[PDB]
Each structure stands twice: as structure tokens, then as C-alpha cells.
Amino acid sequence: YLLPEESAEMTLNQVKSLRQIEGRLRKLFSLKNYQEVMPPSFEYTQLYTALESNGKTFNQEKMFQFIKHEGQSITLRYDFTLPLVRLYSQIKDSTSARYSYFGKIFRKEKRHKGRSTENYQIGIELFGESADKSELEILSLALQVIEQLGLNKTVFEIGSAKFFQRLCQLADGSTELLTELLLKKDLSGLNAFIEKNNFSKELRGLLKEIFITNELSRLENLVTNTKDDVLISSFDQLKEFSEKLSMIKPIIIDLGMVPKMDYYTDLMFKAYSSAANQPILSGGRYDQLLSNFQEEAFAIGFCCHMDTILKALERQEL
Amino acid sequence: YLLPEESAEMTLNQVKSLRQIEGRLRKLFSLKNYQEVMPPSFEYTQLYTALESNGKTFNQEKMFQFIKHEGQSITLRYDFTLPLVRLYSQIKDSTSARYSYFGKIFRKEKRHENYQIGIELFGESADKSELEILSLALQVIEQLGLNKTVFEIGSAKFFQRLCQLADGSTELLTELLLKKDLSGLNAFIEKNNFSKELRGLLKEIFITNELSRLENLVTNTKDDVLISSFDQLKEFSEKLSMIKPIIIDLGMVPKMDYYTDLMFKAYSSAANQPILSGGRYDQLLSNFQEEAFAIGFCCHMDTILKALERQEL
Amino acid sequence: YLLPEESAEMTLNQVKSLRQIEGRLRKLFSLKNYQEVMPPSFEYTQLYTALENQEKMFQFIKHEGQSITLRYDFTLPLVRLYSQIKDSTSARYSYFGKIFRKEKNYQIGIELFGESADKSELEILSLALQVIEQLGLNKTVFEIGSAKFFQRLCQLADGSTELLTELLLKKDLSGLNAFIEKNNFSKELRGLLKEIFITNELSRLENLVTNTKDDVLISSFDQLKEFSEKLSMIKPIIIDLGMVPKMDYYTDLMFKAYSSAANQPILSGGRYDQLLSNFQEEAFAIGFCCHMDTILKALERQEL
Amino acid sequence: YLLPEESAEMTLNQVKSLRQIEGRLRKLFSLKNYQEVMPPSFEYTQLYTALFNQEKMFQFIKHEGQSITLRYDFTLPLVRLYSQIKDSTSARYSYFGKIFRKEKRHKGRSTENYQIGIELFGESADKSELEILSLALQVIEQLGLNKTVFEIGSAKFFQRLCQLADGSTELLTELLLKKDLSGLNAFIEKNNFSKELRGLLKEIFITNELSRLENLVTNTKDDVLISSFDQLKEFSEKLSMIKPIIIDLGMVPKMDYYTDLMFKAYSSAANQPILSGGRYDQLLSNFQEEAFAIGFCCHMDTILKALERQEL
Amino acid sequence: MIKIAITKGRIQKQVTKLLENADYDVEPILNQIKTKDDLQIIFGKPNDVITFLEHGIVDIGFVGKDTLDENDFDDYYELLYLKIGQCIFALASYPDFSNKNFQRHKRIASKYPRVTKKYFAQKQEDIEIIKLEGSVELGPVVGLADAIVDIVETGNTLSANGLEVIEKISDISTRMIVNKSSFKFKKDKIIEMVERLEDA
Amino acid sequence: MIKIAITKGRIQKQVTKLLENADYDVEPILLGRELQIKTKDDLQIIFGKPNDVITFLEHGIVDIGFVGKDTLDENDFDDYYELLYLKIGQCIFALASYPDFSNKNFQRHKRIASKYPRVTKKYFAQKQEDIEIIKLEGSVELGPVVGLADAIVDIVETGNTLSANGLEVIEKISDISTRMIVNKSSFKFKKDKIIEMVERLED
Amino acid sequence: MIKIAITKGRIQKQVTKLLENADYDVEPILNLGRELQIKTKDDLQIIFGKPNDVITFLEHGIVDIGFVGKDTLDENDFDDYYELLYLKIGQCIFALASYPDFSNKNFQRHKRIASKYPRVTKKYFAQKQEDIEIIKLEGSVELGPVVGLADAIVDIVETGNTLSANGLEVIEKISDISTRMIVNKSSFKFKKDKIIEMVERLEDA
Ligand SMILES: O=P(O)(O)OC[C@H]1O[C@H](OP(=O)(O)OP(=O)(O)O)[C@H](O)[C@@H]1O
Ligand SMILES: O=P(O)(O)OC[C@H]1O[C@H](OP(=O)(O)OP(=O)(O)O)[C@H](O)[C@@H]1O
Ligand SMILES: O=P(O)(O)OC[C@H]1O[C@H](OP(=O)(O)OP(=O)(O)O)[C@H](O)[C@@H]1O
């Protein structure tokens, strides 16, 4: 008759369609040599809480947990990356690993709203492979997946945490603030911000702009004018990606991008659908994570938010 | 690092393998017109403990549950058939439904996830249904890729009737059959004033499936119900022989208390547990909608995969 | 830091005050021959089933893999403890502790098993009234009711107990009228229903009941009337025919006492033979319980 | 039917007898001006783990979805309750209840541990230690146990001892706990320990004769050790009139946060201590500021057990 | 004395009115008061009147069934019930509603999620409830939801939008709720007022 | 072939004995230090302690296994078939203690010692009485002799061990005897041989 | 007087022996069999039993001093005692035995080890960082790897004659084993004298 509220219900069609895409992506992933892995459904909460990012993504209040026999605190799959990162540590051969996953994560969201609790994701991880090769391989794949999804109007955005980080330090080290500013594109708070400080013309001109434009030429200049090696350097890496992947799909460069996670190493990227409010795909490189376990290696990957993608597929037909 | 005793860990190869069979089965199912449905991950405890069993008190000890914001008891998917039986009650047009599912349930084990693949069939014609499911079940097995397997079928009507005839001691006989407790049976028979026939049968169903041997023993009882129930199974043994020799287990104990009549399970020699268990259970549909024909099986992927490994060696 | 929504903190004075009452009550009980028992803190979830929700009880799993629960109730463990006696004699138990439940609990009670029918009821009614006088509350009322009367009331109400119960609980006067409408009930039965909802005046009720030309109801009111008379000297008793049995297993007598300073009852009890039957045979089970929390909350809200 | 291993069952008499002792003790505490406090039944597990093992404590999840635990300890909540009072005065608390912790089955171990104890926060250093030791001794006289001993030790002495022993506390600790005489010898063997330090180590393990220890201590010529010992010696002489005190230099502080004074009282009819206490200022500075915290605890389960094994 | 709380809305009038038709010193001079009949009255929003009664800030409280049904509070008595007005909870939507048979669960927008839930429960149909505090008609208009559950009095609000009642949920009307403990002791006065307020 | 495991104890004798009378190839040298052997009837046999015999059968190490009811009731394992049951040993589970047991009315909880905790517990359950179970791996008679426990739950065959200590049976718990348990899977596929041997051993 | 418990096995011999060289009324040989409790001229009410039973007895204070092997003291969860003396006699040791090709083989599934001491096996595989499956065996743990039941085992290796005879070799020494003298804490608190006296004497020999 009636099921709980914290349970999403997919319609046959939704299932048929979700199961289609999987087929396409599955064939694609297997072709690029990614091995699928199924993470345990329960994890020791100690594993999830050891994290705090640049926002709101790892609090014990979003996760469903309870007590086991010996009496410890276990939690329902809250994230896919970690377990795959762990798996990679348990390896005794220093070789690259190509993992992929097709499941859902369980996190709590307020009541009486279109917010879903059951989040079905599809994503891949890449551990150990070469530095540049890595970044390129993932960005490519990410674009390929988007082509198989079947959404009409989509955008692929990339960015640099270093550029972000650097930017921050140039802004009087006010990262706690600049971040809030960038997240809300709070234009009136940024102006106020700039007023209280004695920022150079260039830096000020740059801040003001990165919040509202991705036109390469325009940004290119603003950057080189800061005469800052770091900022110009990071920006050129993005430009390079823009150029190398331009033939596949027009890339967009968002310098005002705020690192979803506080551990992102440098490259970060997300793609949006004109028919969805949330991103259909997000990913980037996060070597840092590999550190919590095994040594320093190149870790990067993305994740597809199927719920949103399917939602976009419907709001799309209408 | 370190994981729980609650969580299971499949190796790349196992997943590769699992995902392979799904492919084959998905193809099969879609070919037979079975739509896949994805049941919610959370359910109201009131739905499980309630429908699962009867007359007694079902167990909330095997299921992971907790409380919600409003203050209710929710449970992680404990079962697949129910939510699909529900999904069928919510339908208006009185037509047949062919559902399938590919996921896992969550139960606690007391000393050591449970990934299942199954299909349900609601509404279709009685005769046609039983035959349809048994074919399909047989067809699935051939895609699994296991070398030595057996397909067993039984009848709850036979079992139920068997119990009444036996001084209605179903509580006990069930326990005997379950442990194949031969000496216990002997003692059971001794205390009672049963017939030669009834006795001769009891002793046999416990240890053999030879069609001929049983056929007689049954007809000798001159019981319309037992001979009836048996023939229906004999019929299935004949119609499905060409596909794969079917085995009849008159000493089969209905897994669920709500099984209507036909019930079956398939085993692998490299598997202790059954790789495929199903049967007809109209009763369930009753919990919501009216009386209709509900029948379906379930493949226990875990066991099947375990069988595939312990097999290669 | 902060504390769980489940953890209640008493102030030194609350404790001093709680411990005082116990003291007075311990002396009272021991004088009436009630022996105190300390029921285990853990119990098998399977036992808390006799009361007919696991969502109100704290529970977890043991080493072997079972469902244990924090003391959710006091009566059962004591009833159990009485079963474990093959000596067919009366027992007078008392308990001073707390139970663990969830909603949005220190209790002090007594149980009486095996004693004579009529003597039991009277003894407990007395004791409940003597305890109240040791509490220290200024304005309180002692109400008594009859499940039989309630039950008989329902069957006469076209047996739609599920509804009237909901009506009496909310004193939903308009709903009752409507209810009387749809089912043309006899003038008497109707007349009674409208009243029991809003009055305990013995003279007023007495008549309405004897008019119902019903042996059961009149019989039940009489048992309460009697009580009213025999205990009147101790404390004016109040008869509430509109009382809804708190527990589905109450035999007949049931009672609760309230303070003007506390929304909830400070004392609730009654006879529930039914419970005894879960273990042993049929015997007379009856005993009340004081809700200390409420009693102390009332003591405070009282002084101001 | 029956009952679960997780629960202990006291007999009427056991209840009568426990409640009796509480009475005497209640009168005693109220006379010394000790106010009783009843700590919450549930605590945020974060409070317990933060100073143990979550594997000994019963826990579960609350509505909002956090980890709450059944009272596992009495001292903490009371310490907390003292932090909530900004009045920089002395506080005398007492508690009569039980804590819940898990144990192994079929060994006869209990889950529900009834305790009665007192805490003292804020009072003078020198005065506190004396008052507590006094009360502890008085309490024991009300229990009604025939043969008992009252042992006191110093954590600084222990700690000093450890540093003097090549600072290998991890090991010496284990040695003293098991009184591993042969393990001690071997320990002495491996590192070039000095005659004095050696003769001490060997001795503290198996004796409490004041005179004997006195010398051994002064011979080490260590200010800390002789200092610690004297403090103890003093208590020995001051409370000697009440009850012959016993000094255990081979005493291993039960809790890692013990400041210095620590003690335990045993019964000849009980394998576990009937009373154990000590000063632990460290706890207080985990909320408020540095103050003098000291208080004991009476293990009723053990005490009663002793009272029975005593009559036979 | 007797403490009363009334909802500031249209109900305040019904009450002040009824109190008049039965004699009590009506005082519409406000912009907490006392009357000559010992009635310290207080005013506020329904959910607030209830909140006052819950915390015993008052003994009697006059609110609408519509709120009482939505509000999770249950610890009170519903003695009197002045059947004034004609509001009714209903399920509104576009005419082509019942004829359309989509392939999934429907979404309803409502100011009363609990009622909306409770109703769709007896009807066997899990749904997505979207809450709206203002004008719920927009739900289906803007495309937010398929249907709505709101209070329909004259129906002048739905028609004007192209919506129609699909089914009557329940009858709505102003009620007289009373705090339990207040009724236990002040049972006389509370009853006296009930009997008087009833003669009208 | 058929893999069988037998308990090294007295039961080893009953089985090797029964097999004999069954016309089966006994190799009695089985007074022969190897752990694994073979017979002419395709019977790879193994030996060990009951709880182990059971462990071997549980993991599919062997198809048939001969162990005692006393162990089968205690061991928490359940997943097997108890086909045959050679009623030989006159062992029985019982509650032994000093004569003055039932007459004493203690206010405490009667603690019983036993080598079978689960059977002691299970038995005291149906009898309505929570108790303290003290486990003793051997000579459980001491329990009451040293004062460790008030009574005990052990197996009584002749009763020569209890009387020699002043102990007497208080109540018979259940009959004990050597049983033939079979691994379920082994029975769905080797169902023939398993039965064949079952019918023979039945004589 | 002093109540002592000794393990019936070989250990019994070791003790009876050491007691002799310490000059005691060692008389367990004469009332050897059906008798479980015996008194001496030195006020020693001695009792015999299996190790785990000796410890049980000591735990409940049925006896003040107990002689058991380290192998059991590590496995048995009990911990509330004093390991005063330590007669270094038996050269037994905990080891991880298995077939030679063990360390050379790469396993896919988890290594299942058979053992009579699951807690030691567990404890040992913890410090080595490796979650494993422990199969309990009360009898001859050598069979585990033989029949196919387990890959390796955790047992006590004295001479190594049992392993070699089956084609098994030690993979790693876990810890040294030896008969110890455990004492009940409380008993040591009040009867500290005698207990020490005996400890000093048993050490002399
Ligand atoms: O009498 P009817 O024509 O059927 O109108 C009834 C509706 O009008 C009122 O809301 P309103 O539109 O005033 O919005 P509000 O609740 O935000 O004040 C009322 O709450 C109903 O929703
Ligand atoms: O002949 P019965 O009267 O049945 O006695 C046989 C006893 O011997 C065995 O125990 P154990 O190996 O511990 O030897 P024990 O006789 O010294 O107890 C067995 O468990 C019985 O307890
Ligand atoms: O290294 P070794 O000197 O050869 O001695 C060690 C062996 O002795 C023990 O056997 P147990 O007493 O359990 O007898 P069993 O081997 O016959 O089971 C132990 O289980 C080893 O198998």
C-alpha cells in the first residue's frame, strides 16, 4: 500500500532506460579495460568520518548507521570512491588499476520534497597510471559517457584547485570567505570583499570576472596580467585540455569553480544538463586520498549521477 | 584495511562473472517478456514481519532496521517477491504481469551481499503459468554454466495432505522430513495406528525419487489427493524431460508456509544451498488484491558464483 | 557539551526529593509486607510481546545473536518471577527503578499476585490511596473505572469498539452525536453515552445506568459504586465510566490518580489476571505504579 | 520462560541487604555533606571514547541518527556536572546506581554493575586526599565485611619508577600486573640497571612491609621516589588509628589519568576490589580548568558477593 | 479563571460572535485580555493556539478541524463543535485528471502534507507530496505537481484556475478544544461554557 | 567414493563393529597411526574427536559421519541428515547432585557445572529456571565436590561415577546414542550409495 | 592452607617433579586415579583437571595456586591472575605450519587456517595484518591441510615430528610455550607469605 518516505521508487520505464545506459557504458568501460567492482553494502563508520571537505559531504548526520553484533558503528554505502581506493591499497603489485561501479549510495535528505535518498551512480576510478596520461584518459572517457547518455543540451566544465588555491592565497589568504563567495557567486559580497582589501588592479579584475564568464580569450588575458606563475601555469593546463578535447566536445573552463572536496589535487570537472539542476557527472583528481592508505600515486575519476541523468531524460522529452 | 563480518566482498573476477550471467539472463528474460523492476531499498517493517509467515511471529532479528524522522520502523530490502507482489496490486487492468529483479536483500547471519536474480508471474492462466515458470527456471540453469545440477519439484498439497493423513502431525513430520530423521519416523509410525500403505509411503518419500517406485506406493494409498498431487508432478516430469530430467521429491518440505502446491528448487553439486528456488504462492496476492495465480523463482547468485568457483578446481 | 534526547537530568534537589518519597514509601510498603524486587535491566525482546511496539524500546544484539531490550516494563518481570513459584501462595512485590523507552522514566509500584479476589482489589485501592498521601501533592483526584463496563459499553454500541474507544479518548462529543445518529441507539444507551463522557456525579450516573436495563453495565457500575463508598472516608473516590482501558489486558478494575499540577497521571493501576495466564494458570493479578517523574514535576510546578 | 545472559538477577535477600548498606551509607554521606546525583541513563558515545573500548559498552542509534550509550561510567557525568557550575567552590557528589558494560558468558561475569561512590571537586589538595581516604575507610566499616585490607599507592612513584627503568613503561606495567617475577628478572638482565633500582623492582612486587620498603626507597637516592613514598608513609601513619593502611609500590594505576594517590580495598571473600578510588585532576581539565578531583567507588556486586561467600 | 486562546483568522469572528449569542463581555478593543466573566483570552495563529493549549498556557482553545487534523498534537478534548462555515478538504486538479493514466506515482502539492498523506493512504497509492505554504493552486499550474489537496469552501479559487474537485476528503469546521488536565479539575466551568456555547 | 569420519572414542569401536556385521571391509589397523585410509568398498575413512567429526562433515570433507547424540545436541551445527541410528550406548543426559538437593530451598541461584552448556541451558529452560552455568571440560563431578556448583549436567551411563562421589540422578534429561549423520549435498547426489549403506548398517 | 590445581597432562609430571626437588610430600602417584582432591603434609589441598578447568577453578577461587601451560593462558580469555613463577621446562612453541609451497603460492580467497587455539591464531594473524578464516579443531590439527580443510595451521610444535611425518614444515615461530605458576590475586593478597615462600622454593630447584 504505502512505503516509507526515505525510499525512492523507479518506474518500469525508468528502470528500462537506466538499464539501457548501463549497457552502453558497460560495453564502453570494458573496451577501455575497466574492471567492475561491487563495494560492500556496510562500512565501518570510522572510515567515512575520517573526512571533511570544502563544503557539506561527510557528516554522520547524512548517513544511515546502526550497531553490529560486537557493537560497532557500521554505515550503509555512503560513497563509492573510498572502497575502491581501499581495494587499490590491498594490491601487492604497483600497477595501474581501472575500476568501475554501478550501484547506489544511501544518504539522508529532508522530508516532503523531490529530494531522493537512494542515489544510483555509475563511475570509474583510475589508480596508478601516469600523470598526464591519467588526466587525459579520464577527461576523454567522461566525454564519451556523456555522448552515450542521450541528453540533448549538455556542458562539460573543468577547473583547477591549484588555480583556486593559489587564487585564494593571493586574496589575502581569505579562503574561508572567497569560497563562500564563489559558491554563491555572491557578487555584492565580493565587491565588499575587494573594498576592504588593497588588491592589485589585475587581481581585482580577475576575481570580478571568474565569477561570471568562461570565454577563453577574455580569461586568458586577465590571467597573464596577474603575472603570477601559478595562476598562469594552472590556467594553461586547462587551456591545453580545452584544445585537445575540443574536437570531441567543446570544453568549458570555469576558474570560479570551487573544489567540491577539500582533498582535490588539481584537475576537477563537472558536466551539466539543461534539463537538470544538479550535475550529471562530476570528478577530478584526488591523489591525497590514496595517501590515507598506500603511498603517493595518481588518483582520478568521475561519477555519473543517474538519478539526475534519468530525471533530465524525462524533463527533456517534454 | 579492515571491513565488517556483516559485509561481503566480491573479487573483480566474481563481479565480472556475475555481471556476465546477468547479461545472458537479462537477454533471456527480455526475450520472454519479463520487465525488470527495482524495488525500494527501504520498506516499512510492518510489511515484512506481517506477510512472511502466519499464526506465529515472524523474525525481525534477521533484518537490518532502524527508525525514521517521524518515528516508524523501516527495514532494508529483506525480500523481493513482496514489493513486486505489491507493485502488482497497484495495477488496475486485470492482466498478467512478468516481473524480474536483479539486486540483493539484506539479512543478518548469525555466523557469516545476498545477491538475487528472479522473476515473478502474476495473473496468467494457472496451467500455462506453472509450465511457463518451470521452463524458464530450466532455461536459466542452462545459462548459469554449472556442470552437474539437478532440478527438483514437489507439491505442498501432497505434503499437506501427507501431514493430515498422518494424524495431522504436521509440526512433527515437517521436522522429521527436514532432518530425514529415519529412526524418528520409525518411532513416529510406531506410536500411531497408521495403515500399511501410509506407512510404506512415509518411509520411502524420505529417501528416493525413483518415479516408478513412488508412483505405486502412492496409488496404493487409494487417496484421491495424494495420487492427484503426484500425477500433476509426474506430468511435469514428462513434459519437461526433453529439456532436463526432472526429479520429484515427495519428501520436500515447503520452504514458505504460504506455498500453494507446486514448489521446486535446483541444486548444484558444488553448492550446499540451492541455486534456484521457486514455486506457486497464490496466498501472497491475497494479502492485497483478490485471488490470482502467483508463481516465480529466485536465483541465489552468491551460491551460484560459489558453485562456479568450487567447480573449476 | 549536550545530552541525548533520551537522557533526563535530575537536579540534586529533585534527587533529594525523589529519595525522600521512596523513603516514606519504602517504610509504608514494608509495613504492608511488600518485598522489593530488582528486575533485570536486559530482557529478551520476545517477552515484551505478551502486552497484546518495538519502536519505543531500546534494543540491540547479543553475542549469540539475539534481540535483547532494556527494561521496558516492570509488571512482566515480576509476573514472571511469580510464575517461577510452584508454591500456590500470594505474593506482594514492590519496585523502585526506571524503564527505558522512546517518545518525543523512574517508577515505583507494587504488584499483588494470588491473593483473594475481593480482598486484593480493596487492598490495592487502599494502598494506592495511602501512597498518594505520602507524596506531598496538595490537590489530587483518584479515579476508578471498569473495563467490563467499558467492554459491555462497546458491544452495546453495535460492537464498533475501535471507534467509541477513539471517541472516549478525545471526548469527541460531536463525533459521538454523529455516531449515535448513524446507529439509532435506544434512548437509554444514548442517554448514557452522552453523559459518561462528561461527568462522574454518582447520583446522575446511577440512574442512567439502571435505566439501560442491562445486567452487565448495572453490575459493573455497582462494583465501582461500592468502592466509592468503602473508600470515601480515606479520600473521595471518583468513578469515570468514560475511562478507556490503558492496557488491552485489564480484567475489570482499573484506576489512575492525577495531580492538578501534572498533565499525566501520577498513579495508574488495575487488575489484569490475563497476564498471569501467559505463564502460570488463572489467579488474581493486580498492582499500581507511581510515575515519579510526573510526581516530582508536579511537586515543583506546585510550589510556584 | 527464562532470562538472558545479559542480565543479572538479585535475590530478595540480596536486594534487602544491598538496600540496607545503602541506608547506612546514605546517612554517612549526608552527614559529611555529600549530595547525591543521578546521572542520565544515556550518554553520547563521544563522551566515553574521549578520555576504554566501545566493545564493552551497549550502544545504539537515536532518532537524529547518533551513537548514544548506556551509563558506562559514573565519574564522568559527575565531572561534567561540576563543569556546569561556574561557582569556583568545592562540590561533594555521591551516586547509587549501576553502569552497563559487556562481559564473557558462562564464566559467571556480570553486565549490570551496581556501584555506590562519591566524588569531590574543588576542595583543598591536602585536605581532599585526607577526607576521601577517611570516608573510604569509614564506608568499609559499614559494609559489614570481616577481613579486609585497604591498599594505597602513588602514580607518580609508579611513573618515576617507569622512567628510571629505561622508560619502558609498556613492559614494566605488564610485569607488575601479572607480578611476573621471572619476566622481571629477565627485564633486569637485558639493561644495565643499578643495584638500588634492581633491589627495589624485585621487592615492590612482593611486599608491603613499611620498614623494608622505606630503606630500599631512600637507597635509590631519587628525590621523586623517596618523595612519593613519604607522602604514602604519612597517610599510613595518619589513618593507622582508623584501620591499618597498606602501601603497594607495585600498584599499577587502573586508569591512565590518575594524578598520584590511588587506592583499592579488597575483601578476603572477593576476587575483585570492593572499593577503588584515587585522585584524577586530569579529568577535570578536559572540561573546566585544573582543580583537585578525587573520589572512590564501591563495587556493590562484589561486596554483596563477599557478604555471602563470607557467611559460609 | 478560564484561559482561552483563539485563532486570529476568520475563526476569531465566529468565536467572538458565538460568545456574544451566549452572554460574555465581548472585547474587540485589541490591537492578552480579561473579561468580566473571568476569561483571560489570548490570540494567535492556529498552530499557535494549539501550542498554547498544549503547554497549558490556556485551558480552552478554539481552532479549525483543518489544523487539528494536520497538527500532530493529540492530547486534548474536542468538546463542543460549532458547525459554522462550509470548508472541506478536497482533492483538486485539472478535469483531464482521472482520465490520464501515467506510468509512475503522482505528485500532489499541499499546505497540509499529513492530511494529504493520510488521505492517499486509505486510497492505496503512494505519492510524492510537495509542500506549499501559500497558494497551492500554483502547484499544477506551474507544472510543479499533478494534483492538490487543499481546503475548498466556495470553489471560487479552483474554477478561476481551471481546476475542479476530484473528491471530497473530509468536512472542516471550527472546534472547541480543551486541555485535558484543565477539564479534570475545572470541569464545571468548562462544562458550563460548553452547555452555554451550545445554545446557538 | 564415500568419505566417512568416525569419532576416535568408544564410538569408533561400535562403528567399526557395525560395519563388520554389515559385510563391509573392516581394516582394523585403522591401531595404525595414519589419519586418512581407504577400504575395498570405496570408503575413504577419517577419524578424530566428535566436534571435529562434525566440523569435517560441515565443510564437506566427508559425506557420512558417525558421532554421538550428546555431541549433536550440544554442537550448534544443524545442517545434516540423521539417517541411521544404531541404538547401542545406554548413555543419558541427566541432572546429578547431592541427595539433599531437591529438599534444599536456597534464596540464591543454583549454579550447575557441565561439559555441555547448551544442553544444561536448554534443559533448565523448559523447566522454567534461570541458572548459572559453569563449564568444565572434564570430570564435572568436582563442580559439587569442591563447592564450585550446586549440581551438574553430564552423561550418566552406569552411574558408577556419581555414586562413588555421593551423587545421584535428580531427573533424566534425554536418551543418548551413536548416530549416523550425513551431509545434505552428499545425499542429493550420492543418494544411492548413502542409502545402500544405510539399509545394510540397519541390520 | 594452600589449595593448588594442576593440569592432568604432562604438566602434572613437571610439577609433581619440581615439587619433589623443592622437597614436598609429593604423593599424587599413590592415589593417582579416581581421586581428584588430595592433601599433603605441607598443607596443600591439591586438585587436578584439564588446563581450562584448572584456570576455571583458580578463577572462582576454588584454589589459590594453579599450574598450567602458557599455551592455555594465552588462549583462555581469563586474565585476572598472577604469573609469579615460571618453570622453564617444555620446549613447546606456537607456530604456523603448512606445506612447503605455502609462502610461494599466491592465494585468491582468504587463507583458512585450522587450529585448536583460535584466539592465538586470531591474535597472531592480527599483528601480521591479515584477516583470515579460522577453522576450529579439537583433535589433530595436522588433518586440516591434509584432507583439504585448511591451507595452514597454528599449533604447538615441540619436536616437529608430527609435522614432518605429514609433509609439513614450520613457516614462522609464533611464541615460546612453557608451564607457569598462576596465582589467584586475592589469595596472594592475604596468604602472600606462603605463596611467596613456595615461589622462592620452587625457584630454587
Ligand atoms: O473559498 P474558495 O474560493 O474555495 O477559496 C479557498 C482558498 O482560499 C484561501 O487561501 P488563499 O487563496 O487566500 O491563500 P493563503 O492561504 O496564502 O491566504 C483558503 O486557505 C483556501 O486555500
Ligand atoms: O561410566 P559413566 O558413569 O557414564 O562415566 C563416564 C564419564 O567419563 C567421561 O568424562 P571424563 O573424560 O572427563 O572422565 P571422568 O570419568 O574422570 O569424568 C564422560 O564424559 C563421563 O562423564
Ligand atoms: O611437535 P611434536 O613434538 O610432534 O608435538 C606436537 C603435537 O602434539 C600435540 O598432539 P595432540 O596431543 O593434540 O595429539 P594428536 O596429534 O594425536 O591429536 C599437538 O597437537 C601436535 O600435534
UniProtKB/Swiss-Prot annotation, chain B:
GO MF annotation terms: catalytic activity, acting on a protein; histidine-tRNA ligase activity; transferase activity
Gene Ontology cellular component list: cytoplasm
Pathway as given in its UniProt record: Amino-acid biosynthesis; L-histidine biosynthesis; L-histidine from 5-phospho-alpha-D-ribose 1-diphosphate: step 1/9
Pfam families: tRNA-synt_His
Keywords: Amino-acid biosynthesis, Cytoplasm, Histidine biosynthesis
One example of a Gene Ontology biological process annotation: L-histidine biosynthetic process
Localization per Swiss-Prot or TrEMBL: Cytoplasm
Main location group: cytoplasm
Alphabetized InterPro entries for the sequence: aa-tRNA-synth_II (IPR006195), aa-tRNA-synth_II/BPL/LPL (IPR045864), HisRS-like_core (IPR041715), HisRS/HisZ (IPR004516), HisZ (IPR004517)
Family: Belongs to the class-II aminoacyl-tRNA synthetase family. HisZ subfamily.
Other comment: This function is generally fulfilled by the C-terminal part of HisG, which is missing in some bacteria such as this one. The stability and homogeneity of the HisG-HisZ complex is apparently increased by ATP and 5-phosphoribose 1-diphosphate but decreased in the presence of the regulatory inhibitor histidine.
General function of this protein: Required for the first step of histidine biosynthesis. May allow the feedback regulation of ATP phosphoribosyltransferase activity by histidine.
UniProt subunit comment: Heterooctamer composed of four HisG and four HisZ subunits.
Protein name (Swiss-Prot/TrEMBL): ATP phosphoribosyltransferase regulatory subunit
Organism: Lactococcus lactis subsp. lactis (strain IL1403)
Lineage: Bacteria, Bacillati, Bacillota, Bacilli, Lactobacillales
Curated annotation (Swiss-Prot), chain C:
Protein family membership: Belongs to the class-II aminoacyl-tRNA synthetase family. HisZ subfamily.
Domain of life: Bacteria
Gene name in the database record: hisZ
GO biological process: histidyl-tRNA aminoacylation; L-histidine biosynthetic process
Role of this protein: Required for the first step of histidine biosynthesis. May allow the feedback regulation of ATP phosphoribosyltransferase activity by histidine.
Note: This function is generally fulfilled by the C-terminal part of HisG, which is missing in some bacteria such as this one.
UniProt keyword list: Amino-acid biosynthesis, Cytoplasm, Histidine biosynthesis
Compartments, as annotated in UniProt: Cytoplasm
Protein name from the UniProt record: ATP phosphoribosyltransferase regulatory subunit
Keyword Nucleotide-binding among record annotations: no
From Swiss-Prot, chain D:
Presence of the UniProt keyword Cytoplasm in the record: yes
Any one Gene Ontology cellular component term annotated for this protein: cytoplasm
Pfam families reported in the protein's UniProt record: tRNA-synt_His
Domain of life: Bacteria
Keyword rRNA processing recorded: no
Miscellaneous comment text of the record: This function is generally fulfilled by the C-terminal part of HisG, which is missing in some bacteria such as this one.
Family: Belongs to the class-II aminoacyl-tRNA synthetase family. HisZ subfamily.
Oligomer status and interactors: Heterooctamer composed of four HisG and four HisZ subunits.
Function recorded in the entry: Required for the first step of histidine biosynthesis. May allow the feedback regulation of ATP phosphoribosyltransferase activity by histidine.
Name of the protein described by the UniProt record: ATP phosphoribosyltransferase regulatory subunit
From Swiss-Prot, chain F:
Catalytic activity: 1-(5-phospho-beta-D-ribosyl)-ATP + diphosphate = 5-phospho-alpha-D-ribose 1-diphosphate + ATP
GO molecular function: ATP binding; ATP phosphoribosyltransferase activity
Domain of life: Bacteria
CDD domains per UniProt: PBP2_HisGs (cd13595)
Keyword Cell membrane among UniProt keywords: no
Pfam family, one: HisG
Note: The stability and homogeneity of the HisG-HisZ complex is apparently increased by ATP and 5-phosphoribose 1-diphosphate but decreased in the presence of the regulatory inhibitor histidine.
Family of this protein: Belongs to the ATP phosphoribosyltransferase family. Short subfamily.
Subunit structure: Heterooctamer composed of four HisG and four HisZ subunits.
Domain commentary: Lacks the C-terminal regulatory region which is replaced by HisZ.
Known role: Catalyzes the condensation of ATP and 5-phosphoribose 1-diphosphate to form N'-(5'-phosphoribosyl)-ATP (PR-ATP). Has a crucial role in the pathway because the rate of histidine biosynthesis seems to be controlled primarily by regulation of HisG enzymatic activity.
Protein name as annotated: ATP phosphoribosyltransferase
Originating species: Lactococcus lactis subsp. lactis (strain IL1403)
